[PDB]
Every structure is written in structure tokens, then in C-alpha cells.
Amino acid sequence: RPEKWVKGVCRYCGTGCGVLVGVKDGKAVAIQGNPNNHNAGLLCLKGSLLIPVLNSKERVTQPLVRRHKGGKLEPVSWDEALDLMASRFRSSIDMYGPNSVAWYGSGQCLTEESYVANKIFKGGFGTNNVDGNPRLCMASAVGGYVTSFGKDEPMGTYADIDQATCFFIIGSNTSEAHPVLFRRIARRKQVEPGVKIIVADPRRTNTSRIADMHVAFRPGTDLAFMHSMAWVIINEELDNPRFWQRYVNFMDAEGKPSDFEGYKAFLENYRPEKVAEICRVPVEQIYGAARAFAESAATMSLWCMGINQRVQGVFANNLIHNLHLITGQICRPGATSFSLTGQPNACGGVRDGGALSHLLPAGRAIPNAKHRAEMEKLWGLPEGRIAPEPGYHTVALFEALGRGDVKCMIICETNPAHTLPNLNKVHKAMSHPESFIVCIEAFPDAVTLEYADLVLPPAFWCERDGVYGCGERRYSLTEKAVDPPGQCRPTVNTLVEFARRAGVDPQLVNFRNAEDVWNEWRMVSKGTTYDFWGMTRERLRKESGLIWPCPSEDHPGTSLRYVRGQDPCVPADHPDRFFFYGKPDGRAVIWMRPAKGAAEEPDAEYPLYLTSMRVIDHWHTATMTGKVPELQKANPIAFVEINEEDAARTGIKHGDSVIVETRRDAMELPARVSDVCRPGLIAVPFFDPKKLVNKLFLDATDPVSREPEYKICAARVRKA
Numbered sequence: 001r002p003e004k005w006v007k008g009v010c011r012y013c014g015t016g017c018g019v020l021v022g023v024k025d026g027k028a029v030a031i032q033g034n035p036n037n038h039n040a041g042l043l044c045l046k047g048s049l050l051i052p053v054l055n056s057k058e059r060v061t062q063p064l065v066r067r068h069k070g071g072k073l074e075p076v077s078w079d080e081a082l083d084l085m086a087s088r089f090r091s092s093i094d095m096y097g098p099n100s101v102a103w104y105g106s107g108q109c110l111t112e113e114s115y116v117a118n119k120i121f122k123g124g125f126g127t128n129n130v131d132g133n134p135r136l137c138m139a140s141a142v143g144g145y146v147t148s149f150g151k152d153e154p155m156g157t158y159a160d161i162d163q164a165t166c167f168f169i170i171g172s173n174t175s176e177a178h179p180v181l182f183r184r185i186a187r188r189k190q191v192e193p194g195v196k197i198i199v200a201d202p203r204r205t206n207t208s209r210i211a212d213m214h215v216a217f218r219p220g221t222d223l224a225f226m227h228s229m230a231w232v233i234i235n236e237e238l239d240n241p242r243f244w245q246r247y248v249n250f251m252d253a254e255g256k257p258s259d260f261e262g263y264k265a266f267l268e269n270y271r272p273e274k275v276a277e278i279c280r281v282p283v284e285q286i287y288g289a290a291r292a293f294a295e296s297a298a299t300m301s302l303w304c305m306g307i308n309q310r311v312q313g314v315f316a317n318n319l320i321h322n323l324h325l326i327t328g329q330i331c332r333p334g335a336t337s338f339s340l341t342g343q344p345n346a347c348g349g350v351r352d353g354g355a356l357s358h359l360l361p362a363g364r365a366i367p368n369a370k371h372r373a374e375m376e377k378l379w380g381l382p383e384g385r386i387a388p389e390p391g392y393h394t395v396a397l398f399e400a401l402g403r404g405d406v407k408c409m410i411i412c413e414t415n416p417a418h419t420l421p422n423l424n425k426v427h428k429a430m431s432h433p434e435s436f437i438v439c440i441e442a443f444p445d446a447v448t449l450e451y452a453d454l455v456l457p458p459a460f461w462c463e464r465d466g467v468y469g470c471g472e473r474r475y476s477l478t479e480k481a482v483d484p485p486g487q488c489r490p491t492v493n494t495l496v497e498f499a500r501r502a503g504v505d506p507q508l509v510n511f512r513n514a515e516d517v518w519n520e521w522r523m524v525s526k527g528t529t530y531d532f533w534g535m536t537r538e539r540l541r542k543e544s545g546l547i548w549p550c551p552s553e554d555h556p557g558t559s560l561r562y563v564r565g566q567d568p569c570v571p572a573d574h575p576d577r578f579f580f581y582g583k584p585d586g587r588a589v590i591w592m593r594p595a596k597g598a599a600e601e602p603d604a605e606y607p608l609y610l611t612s613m614r615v616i617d618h619w620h621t622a623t624m625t626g627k628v629p630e631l632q633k634a635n636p637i638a639f640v641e642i643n644e645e646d647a648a649r650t651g652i653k654h655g656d657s658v659i660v661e662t663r664r665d666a667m668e669l670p671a672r673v674s675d676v677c678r679p680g681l682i683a684v685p686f687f688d689p690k691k692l693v694n695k696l697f698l699d700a701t702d703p704v705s706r707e708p709e710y711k712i713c714a715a716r717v718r719k720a
């Protein structure tokens with residue numbers, strides 16, 4: 001029975017459900033959904049079972065040090081820990097230059113933590129070595145959005161779900177990975193039964209059980225599938241010339257200006273009969289998916305890691321946007337190209353705040369000299385303080401750590417020893433005997449702590465205040481509901497003290513609380529097309545999220561970007577009803593991206609596709625959801641999914657232990673036989689620390705976004 005209800009945000013998925021925390025003064029006792037946030041008071045099982053996680057005593061509550069490598073982690077005071085951290089970082093810079101140090105962060109960090117980490121490093125130390133886990137996740141979608149539209153982030157919101165009359169859901173297990181949203185998608189098809197749902201995924205998941213059509217294409221061939229859809233759309237005159245002639249540009253396979261006829265000529269390469277064999281699907285599915293897509297009153301695509309975790313990730317994102325653009329299924333209620341964000345805070349913390357190695361806050365870029373000056377001005381730095389070279393992107397960061405080039409690294413609210421691709425390579429990198437690794441980590445079973453030289457105990461979740469920005473441009477405050485336990489401190493406060501102690505100019509880190517940093521971030525955003533000056537803490541305390549752009553206390557926020565009358569970045573006096581202002585002529589761009597494959601495709605010797613996936617009960621590495629007994633009752637440990645008519649024809653039964661092996665490692669797993677994986681595909685989950693699947697996975701990255709291709713590599717299976 002609670003006395004106080006404290007408003008915040010679910011700690012887990014990018015659906016970003018508002019949460020109310022019931023405290024019986026000082027202890028959280030109950031949790032409900034925020035009736036006033038988009039989720040309308042609905043929480044999924046994970047969300048609803050957060051109170052045990054918050055209450056867990058299995059927490060990191062004092063700072064810890066590992067005197068020597070391979071030693072034992074032992075207690076140390078906060079002051080010795082802060083001096084040790086600051087002296088090491090200063091010493092490294094002094095001897096070897098800013099690029100010898102790095103920040104490795106998280107879309108789970110509060111927007112304020114990431115904003116301070118990013119400033120200390122980019123403006124304080126003078127290094128652009130600030131990256132994070134959204135690199136493993138959302139970087140393809142950023143590239144797809146910037147190359148297609150000139151600006152990052154969806155142009156619609158979740159509310160478009162209520163109006164789509166077709167959902168094309170590709171690379172997304174919405175029901176297991178975005179359960180609230182999937183229910184809203186289910187809800188919509190309930191209310192209007194003439195709503196069509198296409199689910200495109202090599203796996204037949206719970207998500208397909210509301211689909212009119214499930215396209216179970218061969219991993220990696222979805223680019224061809226989607227070009228092929230565009231061919232049908234053009235061929236059957238289902239396209240929208242009034243839209244694309246005014247609003248669209250066309251870039252050929254080399255990225256040179258082209259035209260509709262160019263596009264038609266290129267698409268001839270993607271005829272349905274030919275592309276149907278590549279994809280291993282009945283040709284009727286291409287015609288079906290295309291016609292549904294184009295004939296529908298309002299079409300919405302939603303996609304996640306099956307599209308992004310790919311060496312052609314940016315290109316795939318482009319291809320989804322091509323369909324919306326050729327058909328004009330965009331900038332109207334129900335009709336948009338909506339990339340789904342995994343993490344609660346990839347959008348606000350890392351992407352919008354520019355906390356990646358090539359980026360600067362609010363739409364600005366490292367290589368852009370005017371943007372550096374804009375930031376040196378706002379942040380009060382000398383000229384040239386901000387380096388012109390992008391720092392290390394994640395994969396290359398950990399390679400630099402391994403070579404000795406990065407000597408000191410902070411890891412904050414991520415578990416990279418468990419979740420980075422090609423683990424054997426990374427664990428060797430993380431074991432460099434002369435490296436100094438500092439972990440800010442709340443739960444001591446995180447495997448990465450086994451490589452840490454120093455561990456700082458942070459406040460978790462609603463033990464402190466701060467903003468999370470979910471996938472629909474929604475910035476939502478979590479207020480503080482409880483004191484942190486033991487010696488846990490807000491990471492914002494820890495970062496300021498680290499900076500001060502490490503000789504950073506104190507005017508650069510002039511913040512007492514997360515609120516202070518928010519007002520600066522508001523200021524740094526003002527005038528950009530990411531503007532949220534209008535999101536004062538006061539408004540964020542009272543409201544259940546605001547959606548940007550929101551440039552004044554009287555502005556309600558923005559649902560439809562790029563749309564005159566809706567989006568304030570679009571002049572009221574603009575000639576055309578739409579304005580894609582991230583492109584100099586106001587036109588979104590269809591990209592004629594050639595369709596290729598995975599970087600490690602199957603062959604005689606490794607004849608299987610290996611994928612990796614999300615499972616509903618388990619959040620990533622299970623340091624949180626693992627503290628909840630009910631979350632263990634269904635899938636307690638790792639398994640490997642195997643296709644029925646692949647199992648029998650190769651002589652493998654259900655339940656039998658098997659060896660999944662790839663060029664990089666081998667691993668015994670309990671087989672799980674179903675019709676989930678289409679023939680020629682197996683799939684492993686990644687929440688079991690006793691089964692570090694990322695040891696089998698390769699490391700190739702999209703050459704633009706530098707996202708790893710976790711979704712595809714080549715494997716073999718044999719009976720144990």
C-alpha cells in the first residue's frame with residue numbers, strides 16, 4: 001500500500017512506457033503504468049515486475065579496485081577511486097595525447113549522463129573517442145534517415161499506429177521486443193479488421209500470428225525483396241507521381257543524380273520471378289506485399305535489428321524509405337516510415353545528444369568546421385579545442401584498446417564483454433595488461449566487471465532523476481523515488497568530480513544536478529531542428545513526455561515532422577505542404593542501392609545461416625531481469641533453434657544437445673525444433689552468460705554506420 005506515486009519511465013525497451021512508482025515513504029512497494037503517457041497505463045510483464053529489481057540487494061554499493069591485472073576486486077574509498085581515475089586519465093593524456101582515452105557509454109544512460117561524458121571528452125580532454133552501444137543497434141537507422149531525409153529520427157510517432165491501415169513489419173519481433181506497441185498494432189487490426197499486416201522475417205515469431213502474410217525470406221535477401229516490391233508498385237501504376245515529382249530525388253547505384261526512368265531501369269534488375277528465387281519465397285508474396293503496401297489508405301513500416309544489424313544496414317533502411325517515397329505513404333496520419341529503437345535512451349541520450357564518435361550535440365557533425373565553432377562557442381572552449389577527426393567507433397575502439405592505442409577507458413551502463421560481436425577477439429582486447437578500465441555498473445554479475453580495474457557504484461534507475469528519450473521523439477522525465485543504497489552516487493555527479501579532479505576547466509562541468517545539465521542541453525539544442533528549449537523541467541515534471549521539436553513553453557510539441565502546419569521547423573509561409581529541410585532543395589531521396597548479401601555467407605563447409613535474437617522474458621544480459629524469479633520460468637537458459645525439415649533430413653531430434661560451430665568458436669546448446677527458423681537457418685538468444693553466443697558471431701560492420709552484422713554469419717551444426 002503506497003503513499004506516494006513517483007512518475008517516470010520503464011527501465012527497459014525503447015517503447016518507453018511511463019511508469020508510476022509507489023513508495024511507502026522510502027521504499028518502492030508497487031508499480032503501475034502512467035495513464036497519461038502513450039502506453040495508457042499498460043505495462044508488459046517486464047515493466048510490471050520492476051520493483052524486485054529496484055529492491056535487489058545484489059547491487060554494487062561501494063567503489064572497488066583491482067590493484068593488478070588478474071587480481072581480485074577489493075573495496076576502496078570514493079576519494080582514492082576518484083583520484084586514481086582522474087590521475088590515470090590525466091597521465092595518459094599528458095604523455096600520449098587525448099586519443100589514448102575513451103568513453104564507452106549507453107542508450108540506457110540518462111540523457112544528462114551522456115551529455116556530460118560527451119562534453120568532458122570532446123570539449124574537456126579534446127578527444128572524439130566517445131561512443132556507445134547504440135552503435136551496435138541504431139547506427140544503421142541514423143544513416144538511413146540522414147541519407148534519405150537529411151535528418152535523424154522517425155518523422156512520425158506511435159500514434160500513427162492508431163491510423164495505419166497497413167503495417168509492413170520487417171526485421172522486428174515486435175511482440176517479444178516491443179510488447180506494448182505490438183498490442184497497439186494488434187489493437188488496431190482488432191478495431192478495423194480490413195487492416196493488413198505483413199511480417200517479413202526469416203523466423204516465424206509471435207509477431208506473425210497477427211499477420212495477413214509472413215514473408216520468411218532467406219537471410220540477407222530483403223534488399224532484393226524490397227526493390228522487387230517497388231518494381232510491382234511502379235509496374236502496376238500504384239505509385240504516387242504527384243508526390244514524388246515534387247518531393248523526391250533519385251540517386252543511381254553510384255550515388256549520382258538520376259530520375260524516375262533511371263529508377264525504372266534499375267528496378268528491372270529486381271523482377272518478382274527472379275527475386276522470388278533469390279529470397280526463397282512464393283512470388284505471390286512480393287505482389288501481395290507490394291499491393292497491400294501501395295493500395296492501402298495508410299501504410300506504416302516498423303523495423304528493428306533484422307534491418308539494422310547488417311553490413312547493408314543503411315541500404316536496407318534506405319529501401320524501406322524508398323517505398324514510402326515512391327508511394328507518398330508519408331507525412332499523413334497512419335503513413336510513415338518508422339524505425340523502432342531498441343533501448344530506452346538511444347534516441348535522447350546518444351543519437352540526439354551526439355554522443356557517438358563522429359557526432360556533436362543536436363544534429364551537428366565532427367567533420368563540419370562550422371559545427372565545431374558552433375559548439376566551441378556554446379560550450380566556451382578555445383578555438384580548435386574540438387578535434388576535427390572522428391574518434392573511434394565502437395568496434396575500432398575496442399581494437400584500439402587491444403593494440404594499446406587506447407589506454408584508459410570508461411564503460412558505463414553497458415556489458416560489452418557479453419554483448420560485443422566476436423567475443424574472443426574482444427576479450428583479448430580487454431585483457432591488454434597495461435590498460436585501465438573503469439566500469440560504472442550497478443549489478444555485480446555483469447561479466448565485464450571481470451575485466452575492470454576500477455568499479456564505481458552508481459544510483460540505479462529511479463534512485464536519481466533524469467530524462468529518457470524513446471523511439472517516437474518523446475522526452476520523458478523520471479523523478480527520484482528512493483535514495484540509492486550503500487555508497488551509490490548519480491553518475492552525473494561522479495562525472496563532474498572526475499572531470500574537476502582530472503584537471504578539466506570547472507566552467508565546463510558547472511552542474512550540481514541532472515537539472516542543471518538539462519538546461520544547458522536545452523540551450524545547445526535551441527535553433528537546431530532538434531530544438532526542445534520548450535521542455536523545461538517544470539513541464540517535464542507535470543507532463544508525461546513531450547515530443548520534439550518543442551521550442552517554447554507554449555508549444556505543444558510535434559507529431560508530424562516535415563509537414564507545414566505541424567512541424568515548426570517548416571515555415572508557415574512555405575510554398576509546399578511538405579518540406580524535407582535536411583536536404584538543400586527540400587526533397588527526400590530514393591537511393592538505388594544494389595542488393596548484396598551478408599559479409600559471411602554460408603558454403604559447402606559452413607552451410608547454415610546463424611542469427612541471434614531477443615526473447616520476451618529476458619533483457620539483454622540478464623543482470624536485471626535475472627533478479628526476477630518469474631522471468632526465468634519459461635526460458636531459463638540458452639537454446640539453439642533449428643528448422644523441422646532441416647532437423648529430420650539431417651537426423652536431429654528435439655531436445656538433443658548440439659554443437660553450433662563457426663569459424664571463430666564452437667558451443668554446445670539444447671536444440672529447440674519448430675517451424676520458427678525457415679530451412680537453412682538456426683538462431684541463438686544472448687541473455688545467458690554461461691553461453692556467450694557472441695563468441696560464434698563475426699564482426700563485420702556496415703561501412704557507413706559501422707553497426708555489426710550480428711543478425712547474419714555462417715555456421716554448422718552437429719549432434720553432440
Ligand SMILES: Nc1nc2c(c(=O)[nH]1)N[C@H]1C(S)=C(S)[C@@H](COP(=O)(O)OP(=O)(O)OC[C@H]3O[C@@H](n4cnc5c(=O)[nH]c(N)nc54)[C@H](O)[C@@H]3O)O[C@H]1N2
Binds near residue numbers: 618
Ligand atoms: N524482451 C526484450 N525486449 C527488448 C530487448 C531485450 O533484450 N529483451 N532489447 C531491446 C533492444 S536494445 C532492441 S535493439 C530491440 C531489438 O528488437 P528486435 O530487433 O525486434 O528483436 P531481435 O530478435 O533482435 O530482432 C531480430 C528479428 O530480425 C530477424 N532477422 C534475422 N535475419 C534477418 C534478415 O536478414 N532480414 C530481416 N529483415 N530480418 C532478419 C530475426 O529473425 C528476428 O526475429 O528490442 C528491445 N526490446
Ligand SMILES: Nc1nc2c(c(=O)[nH]1)N[C@H]1C(S)=C(S)[C@@H](COP(=O)(O)OP(=O)(O)OC[C@H]3O[C@@H](n4cnc5c(=O)[nH]c(N)nc54)[C@H](O)[C@@H]3O)O[C@H]1N2
Binds near residue numbers: 342418
Ligand atoms: N549476438 C548479439 N549480440 C547483441 C545484439 C544481438 O542482437 N545479437 N544486440 C545488440 C544491441 S541492439 C544492443 S542495444 C546491445 C545491448 O548490450 P548491453 O548494453 O551490453 O546489455 P545490457 O544488459 O543492457 O547492459 C546494461 C548494463 O548496465 C547495468 N546497469 C543497470 N543500471 C545501471 C545504472 O544506473 N548505472 C550503471 N552504471 N549501470 C547500470 C546493468 O547491470 C547491465 O550490466 O547488445 C547488442 N548485442
Ligand code: SF4
Binds near residue numbers: 039042043047179
Ligand atoms: S513494452 Fe518496453 S517500455 Fe513498455 S513496459 Fe514492456 S519493457 Fe517496459
Ligand SMILES: [Mo]
Binds near residue numbers: 136137341342343
Ligand atoms: Mo539495441
